[PDB]
């Protein structure tokens, strides 16, 4: 057994998926022949490996985002989460009130609106 993939495979596998993302299928044989044309792998046995790992990565890339390499459409959805989230447009719900000892600060700083009072019991853990 054994046969844990080396770094020479994992380095180029990531690269080949980033710049030829479109050409990929999810079949072994198709992904082999693409790697043969978009690059030269100087061995035959090495080629049969790099294809198989390119296949095995492409399975996971069709789920959530991989943390070793980037593709375009994930950076799209990244941007779409990072410019507005549907949760709020209001700040925060527009009116939030506070309890005393905060009101005393506001009293001495010329503010006197939009408050509630509750004088919660003593004390820490008690």
């Amino acid at each position: 057994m054994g046969r844990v993939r080396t770094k020479t495979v994992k380095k180029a596998a990531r690269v080949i998926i980033e710049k030829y993302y479109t050409r990929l299928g999810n079949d072994f044989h198709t992904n082999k022949r693409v790697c043969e044309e978009i690059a030269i792998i100087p061995s035959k046995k090495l080629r049969n490996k790099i294809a198989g790992y390119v296949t095995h990565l492409m399975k996971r890339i069709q789920r959530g985002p991989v943390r070793g390499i980037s593709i375009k459409l994930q950076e799209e959805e990244r941007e779409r989460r990072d410019n507005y989230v549907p949760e709020v447009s209001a700040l925060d719900q527009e009116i939030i009130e506070v309890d005393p000892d905060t009101k005393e600060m506001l009293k001495l700083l010329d503010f006197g609106s939009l408050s509630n009072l509750q004088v919660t019991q003593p004390t820490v853990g008690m």
Partner: protein
């Protein structure tokens, strides 16, 4: 109303069904190719216990048989294979008439003309090439060719004029006219590589698809972009109907049969829904072809089966 019932399913392969075709001369035959490196000729009993038995099995290839097509007489049959060669069968016992020698890479697509005198080939050479029935090269196309692999070529039925379709992975569809062998036109469209193309039985249309999975319609002689339809994730094979203006689109979990007039989906064919997870819970459908009756259609899958359906009113 015209709807679909699950007819039955055939068995007799160790490799994924790549193509299926049927001659209208004998609709009681049906022909198949597969990645078990053999093309199987069937014997169709119409019993619902089975739906057919393999009659003979044509043998002799060292790599996959990609596409297969029948003769107009039904007495010959031809194959294109990923060993870089083609064969010309005599579908009565076996015994290849001719093997066509010369390609440096796979022969993906292949088609057989109406007059039975011109045979074309798409290759990962990035060359369309023409072939005499004697097995020699009438012409080779290496100028104004695709810059990527040739996905599928077609002979066009016409009034008499010579026109042949070509489409590659360079996201273009080239139409060629013989006896100058020039670009009739270039059609641009589809993001991502093109899988397939097919021509209407009347012959003025090219329904194309690919990685995009959208079905764009082109005009052969007008040269106009009619419209586009959302055909799902990916469409690997297409086939018009012989007795209707429908179009049957092969997507992964389902086959989408579309009425064209008006433009709407009739039904979606679902097969067995057996519990499996998670990347392709059913096998992808990859090829499909109508019978000349137009009642029954067949499908190629990657579980090594050909599922049959039938139209019921």
């Amino acid at each position: 109303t015209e709807q679909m019932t699950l007819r039955g399913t055939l068995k007799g392969h160790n490799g994924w069904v790549t193509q299926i075709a049927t001659t209208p001369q004998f609709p009681d035959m049906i022909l198949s190719a597969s990645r078990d490196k053999t093309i199987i000729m069937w014997k169709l009993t119409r019993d619902e216990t089975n739906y057919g038995i393999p009659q003979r099995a044509l043998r002799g290839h060292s790599h996959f048989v990609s596409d297969v097509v029948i003769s107009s007489d039904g007495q010959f049959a031809l194959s294109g294979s990923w060993d870089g060669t083609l064969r010309l069968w005599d579908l009565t016992t076996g015994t290849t008439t001719r093997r066509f020698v010369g390609h440096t890479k796979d022969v993906l697509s292949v088609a057989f003309s109406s007059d039975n005198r011109q045979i074309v080939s798409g290759s990962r050479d990035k060359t369309i090439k023409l072939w005499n029935t004697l097995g020699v090269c009438k012409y080779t196309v290496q100028d104004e060719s695709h810059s990527e692999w040739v996905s599928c070529v077609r002979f066009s039925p016409n009034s008499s004029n010579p026109i042949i379709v070509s489409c590659g992975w360079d996201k273009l569809v080239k139409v060629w006219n013989l006896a100058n062998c020039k670009l009739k036109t270039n059609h641009i469209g589809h993001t991502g590589y093109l899988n397939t193309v097919t021509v209407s039985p009347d012959g003025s249309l090219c329904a194309s698809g690919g990685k995009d999975g959208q079905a764009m319609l082109w005009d052969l002689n007008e040269g106009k972009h009619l419209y586009t339809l959302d055909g799902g994730d990916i469409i690997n094979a297409l086939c018009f109907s012989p007795n209707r203006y429908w179009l049957c689109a092969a997507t992964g979990p389902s086959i989408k049969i579309w009425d064209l007039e008006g433009k709407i989906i009739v039904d979606e064919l679902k097969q067995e829904v057996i519990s499996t997870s998670s990347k392709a819970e059913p096998p992808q459908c990859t090829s499909l072809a109508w019978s000349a009756d137009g009642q029954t259609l067949f499908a190629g899958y990657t579980d090594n089966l050909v599922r049959v359906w039938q139209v019921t009113i």
